[PDB]
Design a protein around this ligand. Structure first.
Ligand code: CL
Ligand code: CL
Ligand code: CL
Lengths: 140, 140, 140
């Protein structure tokens, strides 16, 4: 089925730095390549579906954030990637399908969407990584 | 007369969604096409003119936010538009002139600038709409 | 030596306005051309170096923010510039070298980086000026 854009767009930003890391300006999520182990949590993302009691809540990553059934934060150079798994902190089940991550069952779902590093990638070049998600519902 | 750029730039963002609306990430102004009735308030915009006791306070919409004496929020695709009226919450009178919205009389004016949907547009495609306003004064 | 990108990116924004200045929307740093005197402080920038006890903390301005040993905020038109000096509020000593501003001695330094107008420039056109700084360490 096809995702129907219907919601705001969230983003997970992560700055990857060497062991000696300098934080200039405002605070953001930063990590040393060393901490980029498998299952290492990045940020999280809050979600609140409204009036979706008859539709399946969904999230759609930007086209540069998913390929071949895998989500990854993209660098400011649109080259380097940080592969991550997307999972809700509750029991709930979801299905991934071409960048879309939709809930298996209807309901005005809400809560947090965890994002963890997908397999140790301690060799990821330092830089500014982003993952953009757009809310919406889904049908086939 | 011509508007003289002299101030910061404010923005009114609105995300238009279907009835089943999902809010991913940080909170912002969102609305279902259904709520886009006439006079339906969007956001508002705060304004504070300083040292303008001898000049007429003014606001200038981006070139993509006004045409032929009408302001409209533009979509991220620079195609879809949401027509809106711009009005101050006080008695004060203003004059619209080629994207500029200036106060009829001088004075270091301040307060809120309301933005309401201009005529029912419940068929406006879902997406991210923006209206950019720049502060300044005006003379002829 | 060469700067090693390793940290987040801070920014100093300043809106330059005429004497009659209108602040539309959210609040930001604004100044009238008149206030752009020599040594007139703009914003400041917070810095926190971590695990840098064996490396020299550093800051690197965007390529459009420095030339020939001088930093300057750039306008949204990538033309107008506001020359500024960069200095830490503490006794500490630093060295400028091709857009990089690095600490003379190692140590996980932290604190504030002052930014003051470099010589009276009361004729700087009104507009939106920015200075982008990226954290990191430095070696030769
Ligand atoms: Cl998490
Ligand atoms: Cl309003
Ligand atoms: Cl300062």
């Amino acid at each position: 089925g096809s995702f129907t854009p219907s919601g705001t767009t969230g983003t997970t930003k992560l700055t990857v730095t060497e062991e000696c890391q300098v934080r200039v300006g405002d605070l953001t999520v930063a990590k040393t390549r060393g901490q980029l182990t498998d299952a290492a949590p990045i940020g999280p993302v809050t979600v609140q579906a409204l009036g979706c009691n008859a539709r399946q809540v969904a999230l759609k990553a930007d086209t540069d954030n998913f390929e071949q059934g895998k989500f990854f934060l993209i660098s400011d150079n649109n080259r380097d990637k940080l592969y991550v798994n997307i999972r809700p902190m509750d029991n709930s089940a979801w299905t991934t399908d071409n960048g879309v991550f939709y809930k298996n069952d209807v309901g005005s779902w809400g809560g947090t969407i965890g994002i963890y590093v997908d397999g140790q990638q301690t060799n990821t070049p330092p830089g500014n990584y982003t993952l953009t998600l757009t809310g919406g519902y889904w049908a086939k």
